């Protein structure tokens, strides 16, 4: 639950990134999936 607390922190940053640009997430998905 302290560990859970830092998970929500990471998820909040992820959420923030999504609302700014889903295409920046797609770019990292691409990078990862093709090696």
């Amino acid at each position: 639950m302290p560990e859970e607390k830092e998970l929500l922190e990471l998820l909040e940053e992820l959420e923030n990134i999504f609302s700014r640009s889903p295409s920046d997430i797609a770019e990292i998905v691409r990078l990862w999936f093709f090696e």
Partner: protein, 95 residues
């Protein structure tokens, strides 16, 4: 501990949840999406450590393009407390 890049992408999209993952995937072509849905479909259980590792690497990569202007104190605080805990950190930087 060492995660294949295909599984990393699948863990990230699962963590986003279906409505946000679907929006991300519209930025990818049809053939990429089909391979990703197959990786997602066979992802199985995601451990809490896998999830945290993927999220940490994702955030570092997403900020790579960003110009940094100060904020170093808060950054150093998080590094010190993750590395050593706050009580030891206080003594490292000198009482």
């Amino acid at each position: 501990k060492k995660i294949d890049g295909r599984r990393k992408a699948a863990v990230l999209l699962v963590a986003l949840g279906p409505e946000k993952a679907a929006q991300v995937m519209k930025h990818l072509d049809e053939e990429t999406v089909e391979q990703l849905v197959v990786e997602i479909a066979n992802i199985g259980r995601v451990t809490p450590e896998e999830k945290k590792q993927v999220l940490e690497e994702f955030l570092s990569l997403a900020k790579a393009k960003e110009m940094i202007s100060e904020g170093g104190i808060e950054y150093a605080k998080k590094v010190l407390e993750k590395a050593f805990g706050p009580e030891r950190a206080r003594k490292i930087i000198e009482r």
